[PDB]
Design a protein around this ligand. Structure first.
Ligand SMILES: CC(C)=CCC/C(C)=C/CC/C(C)=C/[C@@H]1[C@@H](COP(=O)(O)OP(=O)(O)O)[C@]1(C)CC/C=C(\C)CCC=C(C)C
Ligand SMILES: [Mg+2]
Ligand SMILES: [Mg+2]
Length: 332
């Protein structure tokens, strides 16, 4: 049945994706290969972005031109020192399967890969400063993913045109996952020399972002944490809107399950000193089972919002804001 190279792609998906492998492979019809290949192309792109052994001067053209390599049958990259580097070394297998997809899917994937490459390259010579720049960075690495997935759903015709048209809601869906991961991964990122928390926020608490790892700064660290979580909560209305429009069951699950995992993650991290001591974990199997329709997804969201709500310290500088956003979400 499945070709040799396509079988390899699914192996690469299963090897490199904890959050998405299962939901991708459960997608109906043409969406399955289209989303699997989209995933692997972006995974390869990210593996170059993240590799600190590649100079900025070498990295910029690679990220800028990456979308064109999809059309060059023996393009590969042998100099990665990153863990996921099979997708780069065996890129010809991935690009072959890309060129086997229908044109309408090719167009979306290449457009997103082009735009993300430009965006990633832009942020090689700066850190994230303002909250606005934080949205911008998150747009480039995650918002564009949501926009691309939405365009693939509409192109497949399992979903209505509106899904791919409403780039604001698609963008928000991606932003919610990416802000959640960035918040949760403070320490692991710190330990690999990576900084993604917005400097206009953290610099109101400490002089260097790394200072949140020091035990004496825990109180300030948690305050900043709660500010950032409060920011991320503002994406939940759009997530609800986006999910409420989906018709196909496999698409709904693919979209909803990672969103509810992110909500559960934020709730676990809220006011939690452990974020600064290791990776905070969530329920996964349960949520995978329950998050298969809108009324159940809404109920899951409201349950986690009430968990956060009744944990808000009155003294937290963001407490008013956290209460307000939770109220809005509860009222949609
Ligand atoms: C094409 C597909 C599913 C994903 C492509 C993922 C890739 C490789 C992107 C290259 C840049 C990166 C890395 C972005 C970060 C992804 C987490 O990876 P990871 O940390 O490895 O997870 P785990 O370790 O838990 O497995 C991220 C947070 C963005 C997720 C945003 C989505 C999915 C939009 C949802 C929106 C709608 C559905 C409207
Ligand atoms: Mg990465
Ligand atoms: Mg990266």
């Amino acid at each position: 049945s499945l070709s040799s190279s396509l079988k390899t792609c699914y192996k690469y998906l299963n090897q490199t994706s904890r959050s998405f492998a299962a939901v991708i492979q459960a997608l109906d019809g043409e969406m399955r290969n289209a989303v699997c290949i989209f995933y692997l192309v972006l995974r390869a792109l990210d593996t170059l972005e993240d590799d600190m052994t590649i100079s900025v001067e070498k990295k910029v053209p690679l990220l800028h031109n990456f979308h064109s390599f999809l059309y060059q049958p023996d393009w590969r990259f042998m100099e990665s020192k990153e863990k996921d580097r099979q997708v780069l070394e065996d890129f010809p297998t991935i690009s072959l399967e890309f060129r086997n997809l229908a044109e309408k899917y090719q167009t979306v994937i290449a457009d997103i890969c082009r735009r993300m490459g430009i965006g990633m390259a832009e942020f090689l010579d700066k850190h994230v400063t303002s909250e606005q720049e934080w949205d911008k960075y998150c747009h480039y690495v995650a918002g564009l993913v949501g926009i691309g997935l939405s365009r693939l759903f509409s192109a497949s015709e399992f979903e209505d045109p509106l899904v791919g048209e409403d780039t604001e809601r698609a963008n928000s869906m991606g932003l919610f996952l990416q802000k959640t991961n960035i918040i949760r991964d403070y320490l692991e990122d710190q330990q690999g020399g990576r900084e993604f928390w917005p400097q206009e926020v953290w610099s109101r608490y400490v002089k260097k972002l790394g200072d949140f790892a020091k035990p004496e700064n825990i109180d300030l660290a948690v305050q900043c944490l709660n500010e950032l979580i409060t920011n991320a909560l503002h994406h939940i209305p759009d997530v609800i809107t986006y999910l409420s429009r989906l018709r196909n069951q496999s698409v709904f699950n693919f979209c909803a399950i990672p969103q509810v995992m992110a909500i559960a993650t934020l709730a676990a991290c809220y006011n939690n000193q452990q974020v600064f001591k290791g990776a905070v974990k969530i329920q996964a199997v349960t949520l995978m089972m329950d998050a298969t329709n809108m009324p159940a997804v809404k109920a899951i969201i409201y349950q986690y919002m009430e968990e956060i709500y009744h944990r808000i310290p009155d003294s937290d500088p963001s407490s008013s804001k956290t209460r307000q956003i939770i109220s809005t979400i509860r009222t949609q």
